Every structure is written in structure tokens, then in C-alpha cells.
Amino acid sequence: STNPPPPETSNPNKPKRQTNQLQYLLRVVLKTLWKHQFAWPFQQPVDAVKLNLPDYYKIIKTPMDMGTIKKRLENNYYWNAQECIQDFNTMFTNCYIYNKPGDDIVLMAEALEKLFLQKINELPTE
Amino acid sequence: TNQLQYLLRVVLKTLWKHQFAWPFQQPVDAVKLNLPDYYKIIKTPMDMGTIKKRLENNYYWNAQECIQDFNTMFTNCYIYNKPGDDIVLMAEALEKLFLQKINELPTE
């Protein structure tokens, strides 16, 4: 019962770009979330082997983590801020879908998402 | 038409294979699923299994009537379930992929 390959962080067929908003997402939005006390379960892809969860990747088929998002931002993977924001939402929604609304991992994800929505409201104009 | 086959051979087929599609592939059995007041609240149940069978038996007048059933399927989930719920988030993921398929709908 192994872990699948992590999501890609580069693609020669995908148009690379670098805007004012994407620079803000890497140095402001993702920066404060990465330094949060509840960030450690989300900085890497879900390790279903160490967690003894054989059913995680049987349910979640599009995993996402801050480590993937951070590496994608560093490599100019996205075309605009909307693409990067959707990866964040994917990371959050996967946690809310797989876990119970009262679990600690959900209470940690909800805290990160609220801080995420605070910094996104101050996203600069293109 | 050509759009009613695109909705069946492409749209309905790419949504049926989605990771969160299984709650929507069959009609809701509120008695089995232990969903009280579901039929009291949902007055027009809809699912991809019924939509698939209607596209195969030429039930829809045009493509917009079939799209109406997809919206009805999504709206029923947004009406009966609380926002932010797991089942709602799964329904929003299917609606997003569904709307991308509608942008690429061929012309009549």
C-alpha cells in the first residue's frame, strides 16, 4: 500500500507566467500560511503510509499540499493567480471531504483557510 | 442532435468518471441513505443515471433542457445540504468541471 507520485511542479507544455498577483501569493499569502503553527500537516503531500490510511488515495484523486503549491509558484508554473488559488482550495476541500467536521485536522485546516481568505482580500490589482 | 450526443458521449462521460461522481450516479434513496425529509424538500430529484438514460432514449427537446437537469441535480444538493458540507464541496467540484464542458459546447 504505497503513496502515488506527487503532483507535478513543472511542465514544458504549460505556458509559464509571472504576474504581480502571483508574486504576492508566494511572498505574502503562502509565506504567512507556511509559518503558521498548524501548517506542518499540509506542507507535504499526505503520507497515507505513515498515517496508516489505506483509503485516502482511494477517495482523494487530486491531492494538493503547500509544498507543491510553493514549488509551483517558485517555478512560475501558473498562468494567473486564479490557478494558484484553486490549488489552495483543492488542498482545503480535500481535507474537509476526507475528514469529519470536528477532527483536529479540520480545525487546523479551517484556521489556515481563514488566514488565507484574509490575505486574499488584500490581493493587489494586476 | 450533435449537442445532445456531445453531452452524452463527452460531458456525461467525463463527469461519470470524476472522483466525486459516485453520490450522483443514481437517484437518492432517502430511506436507505437515512435522509429524513429529503423528498419533503427535494421536489424534483435528479441524478446522472437518469440524465444518462434520457440522453440515450432521446428524452430532451434540446441541449438546454438536458443542462437544466444538471443544474437541478446540483441545486438539489445545495438546497438540502448545508453550505461547506462534504457532499456540497463534492457537488461544487462536479459543477465546475461541468461548466468547463459547457463552454466548449459545439454550435447547432
Binding site: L53, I59, Y98, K100 | -
Partner: peptide, 14 residues
């Protein structure tokens, strides 16, 4: 343990 529309699995809590 979480249950959604007839499918059950073990969460991180358990």
C-alpha cells in the same frame, strides 16, 4: 470514521 452516501473510510482522527 466518515460515511458519505454509502461509502465509509478511516479519517486522520482515527
Amino acid at each position: 470514521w466518515k460515511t458519505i452516501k454509502g461509502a465509509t473510510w478511516r479519517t486522520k482522527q482515527c
